[PDB]
Each structure stands twice: as C-alpha cells, then as structure tokens.
A paper describes a structure:
Based on the previous structural study on NDT, which shows that the conserved glutamic acid is the active-site nucleophile, we constructed the E103A point mutant of MilB, which does not possess the hmCMP/CMP hydrolysis activity, and determined the crystal structure of MilB-E103A in complex with hmCMP. The MilB-E103A/hmCMP complex also crystallizes with one molecule per asymmetric unit. The final model at 2.4 Å resolution contains residues 12–170 of MilB-E103A in complex with one hmCMP molecule. When in complex with hmCMP, MilB has essentially the same structure as that by itself, with a root-mean-square deviation (RMSD) value of 0.223 Å. The hmCMP molecule is located in a deep surface pocket of MilB, surrounded by α-helices α1, α2, α3, α4 and α5. The benzene ring of Phe22 forms planar stacking interactions with the pyrimidine ring of hmCMP. In the electron density map of the MilB-E103A/hmCMP complex, the side chain of Arg23 can be placed in two alternative ways, suggesting that it varies between two different conformations, ‘intermediate’ and ‘closed’. In the ‘intermediate’ state, the side chain of Arg23 employs a half-bended-half-stretched conformation, with its guanidinium group 4.36 Å away from the oxygen atom of the hydroxymethyl group of hmCMP. On the other hand, in the ‘closed’ conformation, Arg23 is completely bended back toward the active site pocket of MilB, so as to recognize hmCMP. Its guanidinium group makes two hydrogen bonds with the hydroxymethyl group and the phosphate group of hmCMP, with distances of 2.73 and 2.37 Å, respectively.
5-Hydroxymethylcytosine is then released via hydrolysis of the N-glycosidic bond of hmCMP by MilB. To a less extent, MilB can also directly hydrolyze CMP to ribose 5′-phosphate and cytosine, which is further processed by downstream enzymes in the mildiomycin biosynthesis pathway and is incorporated into the dehydroxymethyl mildiomycin as a minor component of the fermentation products of S. remofaciens. Although MilB belongs to the nucleoside 2′-deoxyribosyltransferase (NDT) family, it catalyzes the hydrolysis of hmCMP and CMP rather than hmdCMP or dCMP. In this study, we determined the crystal structures of wild-type (WT) MilB by itself to a resolution of 1.8 Å and its catalytically inactive E103A point mutant in complex with its natural substrate hmCMP to a resolution of 2.4 Å.
Author numbering: 12 to 170
The structure:
Amino acid sequence: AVGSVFLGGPFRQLVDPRTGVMSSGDQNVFSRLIEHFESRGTTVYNAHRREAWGAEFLSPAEATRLDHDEIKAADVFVAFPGVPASPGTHVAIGWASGMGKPMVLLLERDEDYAFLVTGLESQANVEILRFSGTEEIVERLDGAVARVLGRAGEPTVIG
Ligand SMILES: Nc1nc(=O)n([C@@H]2O[C@H](COP(=O)(O)O)[C@@H](O)[C@H]2O)cc1CO
C-alpha cells in the first residue's frame, strides 16, 4: 500500500488569463487522480490544488522549494510531461529521475515527447503509460505504481 505520491503536470500553460485559474475541464483529471489515491489511503502532494489552481500563486522561489521537498518526500512520482511540454514538469522529472524515485509518466498516446523523457524507460525506474482519456489512467495507475514501487532502491543507470 502506497503512502505518498507527487502528482505533476502542466500548470502555467493551462491557466486562463481572464480568470486566473484552470478551467474545471483541466482540473478534471488532476482532481480525478487525487480522489482516486486519497480514497485509497494515499497522500497526494499536488501543486495545482495547493495553489488553488492558479489563484494562490507562489513566488518562483517558494514554488521551486515546495515542489522539490514534496518530490523528495513522496514515495512515487507521477506526472504528465504535457503536450506541449511543461517546463516545470520536465525540471521535476530531472529531480525525480536524479533521486532514483519510482516514477510513472503519463503520455498522450500518438503524441511526441522528448528523447530525455522517453529514454528514461529502462534507463531509470520508470514506467510509461500512454492514454487516450482519464478513465484509462485511473484504471491502469495502481498497477503501474505497484510495479515501480516494487523496485525502489534497486540500482539503475542514473539512479
Ligand atoms: N506556480 C507554480 N507552482 C508550481 O509548483 N509549479 C510546478 O511546476 C509544474 C508546472 O510547470 P509549468 O507551470 O512550467 O507547466 C507543476 O507540476 C508544479 O509542480 C509550477 C508553477 C507555474 O510555473
């Protein structure tokens, strides 16, 4: 049973400038993923919700520090690299892969992602899960987390 996950993904690009928040459709997937885990006993660290989906904006420095602490604390790292790419999320993949964290990465099926993203499959303790909608993710996530979590500590290139 999984104590803690860090859930990451695009943020800045999903904020509506007119409202200063993400739309319910974009919050959709995050909230769905949060519930799923929380209902099962698993603490979810997630910046989108912590920062009221754009309304309670941090300083770059605060935001940077919290994210790195939460990543380091969570048992498993789960994130959406984003199409187009989420700059802050890619920084976080660097952090997590650099700590040898169990990671699950959520990739839109039939979309292109970076070499240094896809190249972590095998190279680190990572599992890629391609998806055409949120329910697919919700169905497959627990298995993906258990498999990566069942390899924690184990040496890897990069780990
Ligand atoms: N205010 C923010 N707080 C944050 O914690 N972040 C972190 O950086 C990621 C989003 O990066 P972008 O905002 O660059 O897409 C999120 O997963 C979040 O963990 C990003 C922003 C906006 O750059």
